[PDB]
Symmetry: D2
Subunit: 274 residues, 4 copies
């Protein structure tokens, strides 16, 4: 049950009709964002809109849609499901055409923790590409996602062995009661889930450090977890062959994931304009 909004109308996601020149050009990549709903309301819509604009600015391609129109399509689309939706928004090169894809959000039970592995792909450094450019063809993320076989996500290190992030998530570790996450200067995407978790940690009086984190610190951590739009906080039970836990996520991870949804649902900055 997949719905799309394309060229002014909602539509079935069986076939797509587009100008051939747009298709050939889209092979160079589309700028994009992913959203989910809570109670069928689009989450962090304004935050995602401004990130989209920022990705679009790395090309002086202005955004065609207003925030007001963006929210209108998001809400009309989500309203056609009796269930939470995942929403992908693509902005196309030169044309400025926008495509929304709505599909049911089927989020699994991750209380037992996931497996992650160190990627063979290093994150592209700033001198080659801005880390915050969310574009569909960027080869670090394209090549790294193809490595996800017997794990949930792969961890991209930067060129010097600093922890950057997962192929579709941000990384946090816990050590001696402190919540530690790579700084934006490590060369990472400023995830919206990450941002919310940092604020939640502070509201719970958990100490937080945003800094350069070296790969070997993950192997000495008391806890590790991932953050991304669809799932929120995702506990990591094993990195490569290194287990953090057997059954229960660690205590800092557990408090953050139980408090995540109530905290973000009542933080106004995640609901502006909706």
């Amino acid at each position: 049950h997949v719905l799309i909004w394309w060229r002014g109308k909602f539509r079935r996601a069986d076939e797509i009709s587009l100008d051939f020149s747009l298709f050939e050009k889209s092979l160079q990549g589309a700028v994009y964002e992913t959203l989910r709903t809570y109670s069928r309301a689009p989450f962090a819509a304004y935050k995602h809109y401004t990130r989209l604009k920022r990705s679009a600015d790395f090309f002086n391609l202005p955004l065609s849609l207003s925030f007001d129109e963006f929210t209108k399509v998001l809400k009309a689309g989500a309203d056609e499901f009796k269930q939470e939706v995942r929403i992908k928004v693509y902005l196309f090169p030169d044309s400025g055409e926008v495509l929304f894809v709505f599909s049911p959000l089927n989020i699994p039970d991750l209380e037992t923790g996931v497996e992650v592995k160190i990627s063979n792909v290093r994150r592209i450094p700033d001198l080659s590409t801005p880390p915050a450019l969310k574009i569909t063809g960027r080869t670090d993320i394209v090549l790294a996602r193809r490595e996800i076989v017997d794990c949930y996500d792969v961890i991209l290190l930067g060129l010097n062995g600093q922890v950057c992030e997962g192929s579709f998530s941000n990384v946090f570790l816990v050590k001696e009661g402190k919540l530690i996450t790579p700084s934006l200067d490590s060369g990472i995407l400023d995830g919206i889930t990450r941002e919310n978790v940092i604020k939640l940690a502070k509201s719970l009086e958990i100490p937080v450090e945003e800094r350069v984190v070296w790969v070997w610190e993950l192997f000495e951590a008391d806890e590790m977890f991932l953050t991304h739009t669809s799932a929120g906080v995702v506990p990591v039970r094993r990195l490569n062959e290194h287990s953090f836990f057997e059954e229960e996520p660690g205590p800092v991870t557990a408090t953050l994931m139980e408090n995540f949804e109530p905290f973000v649902l009542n933080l106004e900055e995640n609901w502006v304009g909706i």
Copy 2:
């Protein structure tokens, strides 16, 4: 007047209907190769086929068309024009689908030379993406293309300041009668025209060095030129604000240009199977 070949037949390049999920996946990029025709015969076809296979093998992707079938599509499409054509070939990871785009080759007289600039985008390091991978979404090329404002092409350096390539071309310099070009070890996208010019130079007993070339050597060169499929040898009259000439290129470039077409068009290795 664009013609395409897609899913078993030739079509007008006006609009295209695609399986929607194919379209979505195509946004991650296609493996690509470009050819042109001389006398409406596709040039260096076998060489271009084997190079395409090389990038396809990186993704464990078999070519759905044999060399023989490949040449049949190329000849068939080129025969529909009353003029020389540019042909772009796209190969899609996992699906193995092939897309050909034929268009009129409009080739200007560039004897007078072009302007080029040093790009602000460094070639993606080998730890992040193979330098020789011809995938349409690679962000070094994509972002470097957007800097082409008052110039012909821009020059991408590697992280260390060595010369790699232009955004659509290979780079050659001449210093004290030697033809010098970045080695494959410099981490480059190597085009067939580059190899052809190297062989031409050797046949004329012009010394050739394929080595690491530092950016500042471009600024001290006696002559500089670009190579690419559609235009062959393109003299550079100016790099940033640094002039090489005002009217006509130097002796080594001029000799290479005047001998290029006679030499490459009479070499059997460029016509195998056509």
Copy 3:
């Protein structure tokens, strides 16, 4: 005519008697500073003392000498010459022993400009060694100085091709009337002559930019010059095979070098405690 201060007494520089264990240990390097005199008064004595302390702190080896004692030895030593002196100060590992070497400053006529060349040695990056550690055995500076054969100094680029500095000087360029010099974040030593020249440029209403400077900008510059303790402002007439001028240094360089000595002789921060 070379004088030394060693183990509490002034001495002839023919022989030196030291504990063998100190000699073996000194093969690992001594922290050091170089000074010159104006009117036989030690220049920027306090500035050099604090840099020495900072180099010493990269080892938690505290400085044995007080500033007051430092100035006392500097002045007593300089007072024994009827001529300006060059002064080298070495601080030795673990022991904290200090050695001063006084020799006549024989400064040549550099009004005609000097030749410099790009070094084959890249400046050691911060992850390997702090750029501000002035130690006698650091291999970037040791290896680069051995390259000075038919030039005055060699220019060390950083790992990415940014201009860092000369083997014993800092680098400035002039472009469209702006004075431009590598920022400290480029990974360089904060030279005391450099600092004074930046202040002098500002006092003369010359615009100054401290930023990342890429190697190719030197080849497009209107003017280039070096700064170091012994000589002050040193005009560069040629970089590699690229001439900036034939006879006369450019106008910005010329104003700075004529105004340098009067400016620094009347700036109190260069004379504190003397």
Copy 4:
């Protein structure tokens, strides 16, 4: 009780008088090699001579002593002790002067294993200094030595996070019965003990891989050990906070240790010319 050989004769290592300018130049560093004796006979003398020549050749420095003269000084000095000795050999660039330092080898029982830590100093890149250059002032080793506080040695990684070496040792890991060690291509100072252990492993049919080793593999290893001249094979019981064992090393390390002395002492290549 230190004995030295300097300028044609053996001397007490109490005080030393030097030509002052020699001393000043010695502060830039010496090429070095270390040996020990078994039964008061200098071990792997020819191997150590040829390695010294290799670093000396980098500076176009001929060895002032022939192999035969070298062995005479080594035997003569070792014969003055009633005990095994450590011998350090220093060679000075340009002058070609040689300094030998003989001292009692006091060798502890390290069967129980040592503690090591990951250093905060990255191995100097190849663009700045050759990785295999054994010069006493190299700042990666000098600064890494100062971190040895509550541990035996620290581990230097390269800029990319690969394992290179300890500050005075080579690094080996064991994983699934394979002995793994950084390749020469990783950019390392290769010691003679490393080569001897590799040959020992092969003679015992233990599989050996010389390859690029990433830091995190140390944290997942079954066993880890160091090699260096004075101690041979040194088991690592703990890396940072990560324990490998509490009482005795694993089977591969234990076998290598128990077979080391019998094997290396009965190999003619380690005794040529003695």
